[PDB]
Amino acid sequence: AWKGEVLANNEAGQVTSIIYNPGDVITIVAAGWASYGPTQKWGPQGDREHPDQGLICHDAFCGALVMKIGNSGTIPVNTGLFRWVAPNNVQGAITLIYNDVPGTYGNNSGSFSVNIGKDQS
Amino acid sequence: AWKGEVLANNEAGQVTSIIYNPGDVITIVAAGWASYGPTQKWGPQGDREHPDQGLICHDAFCGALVMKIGNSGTIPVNTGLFRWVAPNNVQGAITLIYNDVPGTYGNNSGSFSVNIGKDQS
Ligand SMILES: O=C(c1ccc(O)c(O)c1)c1ccc(O)cc1O
């Protein structure tokens, strides 16, 4: 399993130790408070009132937790995933990323605490 | 495992399929948007700005997801719990409840989608 912190101001995101392999089933739990700029903070589903002005993930709100698996597009994580299976031909290291507009991460604050495990399969 | 909706206006909470037994390891993932009254909605960690005016759980924010295990007091769930073990004084059915002030649930809206499963032990 993997446990770590994902900083809101980290544009590259955090590469985890989890390699998603064909047939894997995974569980993610995310917690904590972060901001894309305002003094207010939001949880891992982000801010449902903020418009999308070029977010790295168009399927999640600004300030949501998202991920990439290998060279995949962004995949929403939000509060987490329960016994979840990846699309076919999605594989590789899981990177966790805060959902914001590229080049606008500098003013972000806080972080999410994230657990990832492989489930029985 | 169990999956279901926990309504914010359900003062009694939702009894799940899960009987927490001594030594059980469980994972909970909670998602969605709910309100304790305002038109604004919050995730399963609730509203980090709202004072505690007599919440059923003093250890979580107003509008957070909490639970009881059998005849236990409230235990914070928030976004969820990863491979979590209860203290050995707690057993029985898990009831999921929205964190609000007793008698003030009538005006609540929205719900959380929750998954609970037992892990290897
Ligand atoms: O595969 C999914 C996916 C994401 C979250 C879920 O809760 C789920 O059941 C499936 C997916 C969703 C959005 C997206 O842009 C890409 C994805 O692969």
Ligand SMILES: O=C(c1ccc(O)c(O)c1)c1ccc(O)cc1O
């Ligand atoms: O474990 C508890 C807990 C709460 C009520 C009980 O009757 C009990 O036997 C145990 C707990 C309480 C507060 C908290 O913030 C986290 C907890 O796990």
Ligand SMILES: [Ca+2]
């Ligand atoms: Ca920003």
Ligand SMILES: [Ca+2]
């Ligand atoms: Ca209320």
